[PDB]
């Protein structure tokens, strides 16, 4: 279901629908550690990330799990859930004092990486599915969407623009340099790029 890269570049971090996570060396192919998050059930882990300080990163899983991992001990270290439903994406900022999360139960929220508390919320009338999230290059903007696309300026926390040029749900999101471009794939059978 998901994969993430160690900031040194040599090592691959991974998660799956089987309730397990696994971590391996890319440069030699050797697996280095693996654990069941909770064995005894096939449960959807559906995100994983690495955080470039070295640690204090986590996984999202089916029953609104958002567990940061005490990687030496194969147990949780911290958490940032904000949902009843599963969480499709997790992103840290460069300095790890902002994080954002969202889910298809209809809200997106900004997170105190430093103190394990809520800071700010994005909310909407329709509670539409949100399929992906991305900071900009810096963490001052955040694209939000699924059935439709919007972008927020996080430094002011205000909505800026609404985008409806897609004819179907979006499946993955990225931003370019200086927030000056946005890159998207969709169930409309095209890949579309937004910029100004």
């Amino acid at each position: 279901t998901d994969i993430s890269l160690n900031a040194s570049g040599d090592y691959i971090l991974s998660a799956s629908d089987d309730s397990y996570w696994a971590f391996s060396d890319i440069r030699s192919g050797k697996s280095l550690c693996k654990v069941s998050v909770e064995p005894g059930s096939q449960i959807a882990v559906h995100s994983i990330e690495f955080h470039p300080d070295g640690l204090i990163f986590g996984t999202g899983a089916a029953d609104a799990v958002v567990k940061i991992w005490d990687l030496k001990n194969q147990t949780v270290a911290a958490a940032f859930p904000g949902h009843t439903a599963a969480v499709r994406s997790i992103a840290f900022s460069e300095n790890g004092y902002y994080l954002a999360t969202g889910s298809e139960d209809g809200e997106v929220k900004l997170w105190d990486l430093r103190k394990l508390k809520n800071l700010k919320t994005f909310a909407n009338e329709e509670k539409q599915p949100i399929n992906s999230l991305s900071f900009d290059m810096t963490g001052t903007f955040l694209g939000i969407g699924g059935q439709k696309v919007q972008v927020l300026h996080v430094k002011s926390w205000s909505e800026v623009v609404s985008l409806s040029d897609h004819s179907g749900p979006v499946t993955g999101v990225r931003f370019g340099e200086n927030a000056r471009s946005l890159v998207t794939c969709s169930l409309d059978k095209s890949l579309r790029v937004f910029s100004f």
């Binding site: 958002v66 567990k67 147990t75 958490a79 940032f80 508390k117 809520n118």
Partner: protein, 203 residues
């Protein structure tokens, strides 16, 4: 899924409580209240219905300042001194106060005299109404206590009735696991037949 049945799971000790919460502590040490748990409740508008006036009054006590008080020195009414008697208005303001207090005292006397006729009756009547509220409230208190107790009864009568089935099925399950495993060893040992069948086939 929480499935505790406290009238059947009676073994739960304070030492278990300390151990159980220590486990959740080692978890909640690693899992924190980041979610908005209150999305099922509205956010309170603490300033509902309030006027522009009442807002500033809330903000006074919110900042912890004392309320204003009426000055009551008008009943004592000090005479002016020699250096303020030149102000004619400041003398009239004393006399006009002394006239005002004369009527307050007159109305006070009329109130007190009427109060002497009827306070004893009206206070007695007030208590007789207040007594009724207390007994009727104690009636409601007693009635609701029994209803809470009845719910404990219906819980124990359910949990104990289920507790027998749990105890039978548990005792049945453990007895078959040991018996079935025993049979698995027997069916291995009876495959000594494969030994004798070979030796009898060579003969």
């Amino acid at each position: 899924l929480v499935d505790a049945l406290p009238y059947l799971d009676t073994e739960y000790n304070e030492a278990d409580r300390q151990l159980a919460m220590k486990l959740v502590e080692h978890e909640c040490k690693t899992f924190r209240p980041t979610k908005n748990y209150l999305t099922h409740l509205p956010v309170p508008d603490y300033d509902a219905f309030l006027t522009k006036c009442m807002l500033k009054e809330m903000d006074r006590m919110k900042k912890k300042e004392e309320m204003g008080k009426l000055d009551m020195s008008r009943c004592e009414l000090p005479a002016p001194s020699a250096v303020k008697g030149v102000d004619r208005k400041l003398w009239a303001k004393v006399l006009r106060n002394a006239k005002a207090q004369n009527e307050h005292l007159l109305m006070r006397q009329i109130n007190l005299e009427l109060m002497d006729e009827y306070a004893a009756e009206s206070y007695l009547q007030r208590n007789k109404v207040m007594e009724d509220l207390l007994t009727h409230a104690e009636k409601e208190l007693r009635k609701t206590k029994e209803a809470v107790m009845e719910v404990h009864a219906n819980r124990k009568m359910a949990q104990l009735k289920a507790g027998e089935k749990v105890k039978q099925l548990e005792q049945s399950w453990v007895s078959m696991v040991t018996n079935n495993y025993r049979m698995e060893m027997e069916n291995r040992q009876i495959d000594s037949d494969n030994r004798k069948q070979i030796k009898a086939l060579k003969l």
